[PDB]
Scaffold this active site. Structure first.
Site, mmCIF file in Angstrom:
data_model
loop_
_atom_site.group_PDB
_atom_site.id
_atom_site.type_symbol
_atom_site.label_atom_id
_atom_site.label_comp_id
_atom_site.label_asym_id
_atom_site.label_seq_id
_atom_site.Cartn_x
_atom_site.Cartn_y
_atom_site.Cartn_z
ATOM 1 N N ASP A 1 -13.800 -11.762 0.640
ATOM 2 C CA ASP A 1 -13.052 -11.884 1.981
ATOM 3 C C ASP A 1 -12.257 -12.929 1.535
ATOM 4 O O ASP A 1 -12.459 -14.197 1.592
ATOM 5 C CB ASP A 1 -13.906 -12.204 3.007
ATOM 6 C CG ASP A 1 -13.175 -12.393 4.267
ATOM 7 O OD1 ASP A 1 -11.831 -12.136 4.189
ATOM 8 O OD2 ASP A 1 -13.753 -12.723 5.353
ATOM 9 N N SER B 1 6.681 -11.817 3.809
ATOM 10 C CA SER B 1 7.207 -10.541 3.161
ATOM 11 C C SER B 1 8.525 -10.501 3.653
ATOM 12 O O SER B 1 9.040 -10.970 4.628
ATOM 13 C CB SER B 1 6.401 -9.397 3.759
ATOM 14 O OG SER B 1 6.991 -8.161 3.391
HETATM 15 N N1 LIG Z 1 -11.244 -11.545 6.841
HETATM 16 C C1 LIG Z 1 -11.275 -12.902 7.553
HETATM 17 C C2 LIG Z 1 -10.518 -13.054 8.739
HETATM 18 C C3 LIG Z 1 -10.922 -12.464 10.141
HETATM 19 C C4 LIG Z 1 -9.955 -12.878 11.195
HETATM 20 C C5 LIG Z 1 -8.810 -13.470 11.094
HETATM 21 C C6 LIG Z 1 -8.109 -13.597 12.183
HETATM 22 F F1 LIG Z 1 -8.093 -12.578 13.078
HETATM 23 F F2 LIG Z 1 -8.243 -14.787 12.702
HETATM 24 F F3 LIG Z 1 -6.642 -13.827 11.771
HETATM 25 C C7 LIG Z 1 -8.515 -13.877 9.697
HETATM 26 C C8 LIG Z 1 -9.331 -13.689 8.550
HETATM 27 N N1 LIG Z 2 -12.900 -9.878 8.446
HETATM 28 C C1 LIG Z 2 -14.320 -10.223 7.854
HETATM 29 C C2 LIG Z 2 -14.989 -9.196 8.439
HETATM 30 C C3 LIG Z 2 -15.634 -8.421 7.391
HETATM 31 C C4 LIG Z 2 -16.573 -7.277 7.489
HETATM 32 C C5 LIG Z 2 -16.666 -7.357 8.902
HETATM 33 C C6 LIG Z 2 -18.062 -6.051 9.273
HETATM 34 F F1 LIG Z 2 -16.953 -4.814 9.065
HETATM 35 F F2 LIG Z 2 -18.988 -6.135 8.450
HETATM 36 F F3 LIG Z 2 -18.215 -6.428 10.802
HETATM 37 C C7 LIG Z 2 -16.550 -8.093 9.999
HETATM 38 C C8 LIG Z 2 -15.490 -9.034 9.652
#
Ligand SMILES: NCc1ccc(C(F)(F)F)cc1
Ligand SMILES: NCc1ccc(C(F)(F)F)cc1
EC number: 3.4.23.22
Length: 330
Positions: free
Chosen positions: A35, A199
């Site tokens: 992530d 972008s």
């Molecule tokens: N993949 C992690 C993640 C989840 C949510 C956000 C948000 F919604 F805060 F932008 C950023 C990064």
């Molecule tokens: N963006 C971070 C994130 C990644 C995966 C999940 C899930 F799908 F496992 F719930 C939630 C939040």
């Protein structure tokens, strides 16, 4: 040194990707969601409430001869979709595709939200954003990438996500056989802790390219592409019968329609997302309404170049002292 690991979609819609990670001595292999939008390495463990575990592989620190409890440290995280988890912190050896880090903070989940419990294929997350976002208290911890940086041949990792197929995360080197043409690099802002970039515009199908700055984050941990309402409305206007549904929570379209491609700008370069990548299938089993892979960021507050966009490209995360993002067609 370098590392290389295969990443595999968890289902037929590419909802997420999992990558095997070795934790502890002897190795315990867990499948983690890499992530770049978060900065915590947390895992289901033997300390997780038993009712909140449904098929996941769990990390057992008591069986690792290299695990050390990080006295007094805790962590608590909430993701943008409402998910959350929390627990305590160990340090242990962590290896990804041959690349080993000793003394990596491994955050052991004592409690997880329901959305993780229902995802039996994901054993945890491996955060790859900047360490300023790590939630360990009172002592903030570094990410796997930050800990590995010194020993890497080059302070980079690359994301090569597959469309309905396996892909590759590489650490420490750029596979020049994995892309075509040149890599276009663009500046990154680290002020919010994200891989944030701008972008240079977009196009729908074979339409004119619209030069306009879209600030957003490169997030392998988010499935869809979330863009400003003006852009998203211009895309779905080209799909006959598409409409925004409040009961569903986004744009849906008749499953029988063919979707136009979507182009986004990186400097002077163009990355084309094929229309098939934007189809996320029926909203319910047997429905003739299908869910769209491009949705509005209005409710979110930030634009997110998730997997839908990133899997159309070879993506270089350059973690040099002045960081940059690289995009190439593949
Ligand atoms: N993949 C992690 C993640 C989840 C949510 C956000 C948000 F919604 F805060 F932008 C950023 C990064
Ligand atoms: N963006 C971070 C994130 C990644 C995966 C999940 C899930 F799908 F496992 F719930 C939630 C939040």
């Amino acid at each position: 040194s370098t590392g290389s690991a295969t990443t595999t979609p968890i289902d037929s819609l590419d909802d997420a990707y999992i990558t095997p990670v070795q934790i502890g001595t002897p190795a315990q292999t867990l499948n983690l969601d890499f992530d770049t939008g978060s900065s915590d390495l947390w895992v289901f463990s033997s300390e997780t409430t038993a009712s909140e575990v449904d098929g996941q592989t769990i990390y057992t620190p008591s069986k690792s001869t290299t695990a050390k409890l990080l006295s007094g440290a805790t962590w608590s995280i909430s993701y943008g979709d409402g998910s959350s988890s929390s627990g305590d912190v160990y340090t242990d050896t962590v290896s990804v595709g041959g690349l080993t880090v000793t003394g990596q903070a491994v955050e052991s989940a004592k409690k997880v939200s329901s959305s993780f419990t229902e995802d039996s294929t994901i054993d945890g997350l491996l955060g790859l954003a900047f360490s300023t976002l790590n939630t360990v208290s009172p002592t903030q911890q570094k990410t796997f990438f930050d800990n590995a940086k010194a020993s890497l041949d080059s302070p980079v990792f690359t994301a090569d996500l597959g469309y309905h197929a396996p892909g590759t995360y590489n650490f420490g080197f750029i596979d020049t056989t994995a892309y075509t043409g040149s890599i276009t690099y663009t500046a990154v802002s680290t002020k919010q802790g994200f891989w944030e970039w701008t972008s240079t515009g977009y196009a729908v199908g074979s339409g004119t390219f619209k030069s306009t700055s879209i600030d957003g984050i490169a997030d392998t941990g988010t499935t869809l592409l979330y863009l400003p309402a003006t852009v998203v409305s211009a895309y779905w206007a080209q799909v006959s019968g598409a409409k925004s549904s409040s009961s569903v929570g986004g744009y849906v379209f008749p499953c029988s329609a063919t979707l136009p491609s979507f182009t986004f700008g990186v400097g002077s370069a163009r990355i084309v997302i094929p229309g098939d990548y934007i189809d996320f299938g029926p909203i319910s089993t047997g429905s003739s309404s299908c869910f769209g892979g491009i949705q509005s960021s209005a409710g979110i507050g930030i634009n997110i170049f998730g997997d839908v966009a990133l899997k159309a490209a070879f993506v270089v995360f350059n973690g040099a002292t002045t960081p940059t993002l690289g995009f190439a067609s593949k």
